[PDB]
Design a protein around this nucleic acid. Structure first.
Ligand SMILES: Cc1cn([C@H]2CC[C@@H](COP(=O)(O)OP(=O)(O)OP(=O)(O)O)O2)c(=O)[nH]c1=O
Ligand SMILES: [Mg+2]
Ligand code: NA
Length: 270
DNA sequence: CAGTA
DNA sequence: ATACTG
């Protein structure tokens, strides 16, 4: 049992799951978070992402008050306009959009507007997420990176000091780049809650649909339906899946097609 | 697969 | 339930 308490302890750190916690206990004799923090630098196996979880342990365990999330929203929207221009927009989802007084992180969607001209390739292929991230890094807002690819960024963002002088904690910031036609389904997914998404996706299954952030897809009967995911690359469904899309313009559209009563974001905590 | 949205 | 990065 000694290593069971250790695992439950060590998995409190961002980037450490049961597997990594066991290795720490067995190969390092480390059994407390406090020891992990004091020793991390002398452990070479740790990845760059685990190192961020350790360095920002204090900040990461503090919740963000709604008033500060409003400031992150305004900041990201302004910087988006400055460096990407009017073709793009930022929307903050997660527990903030569900109107919780506190949130664990900042969940942002970056997407092209309905008015922006259509592209000839997936928007992710333009490198735009990386350009936006570099801009935020030059401003010293983004100060550490956990993971980054062409669709999803996870890092630590800190609002600049405001003038007495107010100094802010670094916060977990997640940015997802989403195609225009996928925005209504991405708003559903990234607003959650987690349990709400599972319930709605189960409802889809029962009616012969696939629901994800990219769309609502009508698969048909259980047999007609029959490797990384259901069939998307760079944020775009493969043609065979795209052909199944039921176009939607609003969250309400999705509730309606699935025969579920509409719920406001603040009522999505089952 | 591990770990996190 | 379904998905992205390492
Ligand atoms: C974990 C998880 C999350 N999601 C969606 C649904 C929510 C958003 C945000 O995730 P968060 O963990 O930040 O959720 P949040 O509700 O924003 O709460 P915090 O206040 O940030 O903890 O992602 C999911 O589909 N499957 C999952 O396993
Ligand atoms: Mg969140
Ligand atoms: Na963890």
């Amino acid at each position: 049992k000694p290593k069971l308490k250790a695992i439950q302890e060590l998995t409190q750190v961002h980037g450490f799951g049961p597997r990594a916690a066991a290795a720490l206990f067995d190969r390092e004799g480390i059994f407390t978070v406090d020891e992990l923090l004091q020793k991390a630098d002398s452990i070479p196996s740790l990845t760059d992402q685990q190192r961020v979880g350790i360095k920002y342990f204090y900040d990461i365990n503090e919740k963000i008050p709604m008033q500060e999330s409003v400031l992150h929203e305004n900041y990201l929207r302004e910087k988006c306009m400055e460096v990407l221009g009017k073709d793009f927009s930022i929307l903050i989802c997660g527990s903030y959009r569900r109107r919780h007084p506190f949130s664990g992180d900042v969940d942002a969607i970056l997407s092209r507007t309905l008015d922006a001209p259509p592209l000839s390739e997936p928007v992710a292929a333009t490198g735009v997420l990386g350009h936006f991230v570099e801009f935020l890094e030059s401003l010293k807002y983004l100060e550490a990176t956990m993971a980054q690819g062409p669709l999803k960024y996870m890092g630590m963002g800190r609002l600049p000091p405001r003038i007495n002088t107010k100094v802010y904690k670094a916060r977990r910031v997640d940015i997802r780049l989403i195609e225009t036609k996928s925005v209504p389904t991405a708003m559903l997914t990234f607003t959650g809650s987690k349990n709400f998404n599972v319930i709605m996706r189960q409802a889809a299954i029962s009616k012969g649909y696939l629901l994800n952030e990219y769309g609502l897809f009508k698969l048909g009967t259980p047999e007609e339906a029959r490797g990384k995911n259901a069939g998307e690359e760079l944020g775009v469904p493969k043609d065979e899946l795209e052909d199944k899309r039921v176009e939607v313009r609003s969250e309400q559209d999705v509730f309606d097609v699935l025969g579920m009563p509409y719920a406001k974001p603040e009522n999505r905590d089952p």
